[PDB]
mmCIF file of C-alpha atoms in Angstrom:
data_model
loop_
_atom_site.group_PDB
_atom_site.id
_atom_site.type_symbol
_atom_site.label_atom_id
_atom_site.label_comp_id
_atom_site.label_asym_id
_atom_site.label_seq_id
_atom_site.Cartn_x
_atom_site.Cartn_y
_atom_site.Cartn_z
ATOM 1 C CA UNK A 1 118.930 69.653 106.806
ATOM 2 C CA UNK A 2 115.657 68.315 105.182
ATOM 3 C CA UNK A 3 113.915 69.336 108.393
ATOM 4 C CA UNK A 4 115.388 72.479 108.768
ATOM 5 C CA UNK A 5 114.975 73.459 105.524
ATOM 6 C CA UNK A 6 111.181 72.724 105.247
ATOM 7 C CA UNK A 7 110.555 74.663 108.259
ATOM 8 C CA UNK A 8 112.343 77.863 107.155
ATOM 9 C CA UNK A 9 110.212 77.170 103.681
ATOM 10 C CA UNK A 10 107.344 77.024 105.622
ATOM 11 C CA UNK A 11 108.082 79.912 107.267
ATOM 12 C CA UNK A 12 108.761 82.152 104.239
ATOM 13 C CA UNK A 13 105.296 80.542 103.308
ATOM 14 C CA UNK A 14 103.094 82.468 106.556
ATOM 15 C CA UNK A 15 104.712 85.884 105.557
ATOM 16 C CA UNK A 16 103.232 85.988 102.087
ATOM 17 C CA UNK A 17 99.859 84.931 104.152
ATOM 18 C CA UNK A 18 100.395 87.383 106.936
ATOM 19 C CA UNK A 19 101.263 90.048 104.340
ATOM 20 C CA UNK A 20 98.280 89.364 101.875
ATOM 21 C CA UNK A 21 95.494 88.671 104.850
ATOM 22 C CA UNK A 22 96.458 91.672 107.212
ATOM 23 C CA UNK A 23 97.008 95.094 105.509
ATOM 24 C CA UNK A 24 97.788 96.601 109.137
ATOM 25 C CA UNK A 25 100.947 94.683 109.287
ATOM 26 C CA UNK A 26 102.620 97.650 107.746
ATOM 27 C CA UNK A 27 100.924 99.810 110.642
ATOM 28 C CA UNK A 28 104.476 101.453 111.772
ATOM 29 C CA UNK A 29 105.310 102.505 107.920
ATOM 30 C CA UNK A 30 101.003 103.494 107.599
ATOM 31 C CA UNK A 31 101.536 105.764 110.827
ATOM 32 C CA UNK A 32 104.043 107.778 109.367
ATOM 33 C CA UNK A 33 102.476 108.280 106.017
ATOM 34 C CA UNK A 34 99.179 109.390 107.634
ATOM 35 C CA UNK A 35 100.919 111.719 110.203
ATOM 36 C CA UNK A 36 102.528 113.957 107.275
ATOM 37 C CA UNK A 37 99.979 113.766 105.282
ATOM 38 C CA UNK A 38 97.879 114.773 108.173
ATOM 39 C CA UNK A 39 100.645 117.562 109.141
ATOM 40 C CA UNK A 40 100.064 118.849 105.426
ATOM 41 C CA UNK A 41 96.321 118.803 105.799
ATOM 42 C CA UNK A 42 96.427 120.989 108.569
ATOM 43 C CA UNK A 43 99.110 123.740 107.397
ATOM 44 C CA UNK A 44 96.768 123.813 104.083
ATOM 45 C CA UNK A 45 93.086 124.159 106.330
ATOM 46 C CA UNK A 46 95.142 126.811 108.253
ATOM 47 C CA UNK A 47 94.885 128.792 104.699
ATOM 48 C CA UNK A 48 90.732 129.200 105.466
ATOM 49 C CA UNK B 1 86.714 134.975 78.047
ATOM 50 C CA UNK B 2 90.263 133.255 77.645
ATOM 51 C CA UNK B 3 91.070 129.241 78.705
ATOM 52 C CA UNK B 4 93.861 127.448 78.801
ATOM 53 C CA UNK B 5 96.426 130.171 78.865
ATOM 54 C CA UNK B 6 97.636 132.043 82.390
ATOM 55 C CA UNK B 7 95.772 134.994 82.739
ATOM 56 C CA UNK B 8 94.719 137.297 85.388
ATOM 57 C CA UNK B 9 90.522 137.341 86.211
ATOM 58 C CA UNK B 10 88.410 139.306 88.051
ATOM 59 C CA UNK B 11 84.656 137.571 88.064
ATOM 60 C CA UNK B 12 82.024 140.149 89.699
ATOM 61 C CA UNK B 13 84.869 141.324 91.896
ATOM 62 C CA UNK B 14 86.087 138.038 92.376
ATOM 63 C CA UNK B 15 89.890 138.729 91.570
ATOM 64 C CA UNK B 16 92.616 135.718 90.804
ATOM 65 C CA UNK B 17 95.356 134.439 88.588
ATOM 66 C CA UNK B 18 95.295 131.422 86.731
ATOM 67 C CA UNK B 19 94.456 128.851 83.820
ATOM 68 C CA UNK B 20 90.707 129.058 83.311
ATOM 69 C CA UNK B 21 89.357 125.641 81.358
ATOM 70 C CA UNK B 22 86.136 124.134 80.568
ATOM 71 C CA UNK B 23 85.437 121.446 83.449
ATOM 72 C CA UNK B 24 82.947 118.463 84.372
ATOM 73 C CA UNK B 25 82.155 119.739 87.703
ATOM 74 C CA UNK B 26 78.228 119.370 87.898
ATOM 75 C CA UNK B 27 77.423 122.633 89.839
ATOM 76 C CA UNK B 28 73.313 122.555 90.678
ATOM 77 C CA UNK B 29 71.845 125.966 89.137
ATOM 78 C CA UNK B 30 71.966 127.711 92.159
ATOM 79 C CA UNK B 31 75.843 127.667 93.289
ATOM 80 C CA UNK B 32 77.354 130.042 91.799
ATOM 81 C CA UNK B 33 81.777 129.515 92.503
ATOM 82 C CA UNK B 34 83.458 126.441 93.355
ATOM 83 C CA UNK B 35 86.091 125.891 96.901
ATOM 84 C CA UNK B 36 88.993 123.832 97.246
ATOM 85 C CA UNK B 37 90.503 122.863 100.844
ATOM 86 C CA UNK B 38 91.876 126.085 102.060
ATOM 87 C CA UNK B 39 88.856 128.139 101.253
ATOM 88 C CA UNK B 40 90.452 129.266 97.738
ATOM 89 C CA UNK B 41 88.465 129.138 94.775
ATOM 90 C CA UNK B 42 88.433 125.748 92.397
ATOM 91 C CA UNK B 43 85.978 126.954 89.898
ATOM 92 C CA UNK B 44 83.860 129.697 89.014
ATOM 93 C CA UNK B 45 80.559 130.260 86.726
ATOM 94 C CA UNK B 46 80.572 132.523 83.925
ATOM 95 C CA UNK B 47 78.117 135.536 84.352
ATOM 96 C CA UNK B 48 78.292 136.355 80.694
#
């Protein structure tokens, strides 16, 4: 249990690191802010 | 002239609606109306 726990502590421990080093970790949630944002740029430039 | 209140313009046969205001956009002396993203005009210079 000491074992097991420590490693699942541990664990816990490289997602904050993951998550504060590498911003593209969220890249699936990023991709579909930028693609409506993107879809909303381009109705708008369709104004000119 | 009339700011901050809804009005309708016409500038040198420029014609709109909206809230005219003072602003901090630093135009250079020889542009004359300012565009936003869908060709419609952002800002204009005063003739007067």
């Amino acid at each position: 249990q000491k074992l097991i726990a420590n490693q699942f502590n541990s664990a816990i421990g490289k997602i904050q690191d993951s998550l504060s080093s590498t911003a593209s970790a969220l890249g699936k949630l990023q991709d579909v802010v930028n693609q409506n944002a993107q879809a909303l740029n381009t109705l708008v430039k369709q104004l000119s | 002239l009339v700011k901050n209140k809804c009005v309708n313009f016409n500038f040198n046969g420029l014609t709109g609606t909206g809230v005219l205001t003072e602003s901090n956009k630093k135009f250079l002396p020889f542009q004359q109306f300012g565009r936003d993203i869908a060709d419609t005009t952002d800002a204009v210079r005063d003739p007067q």
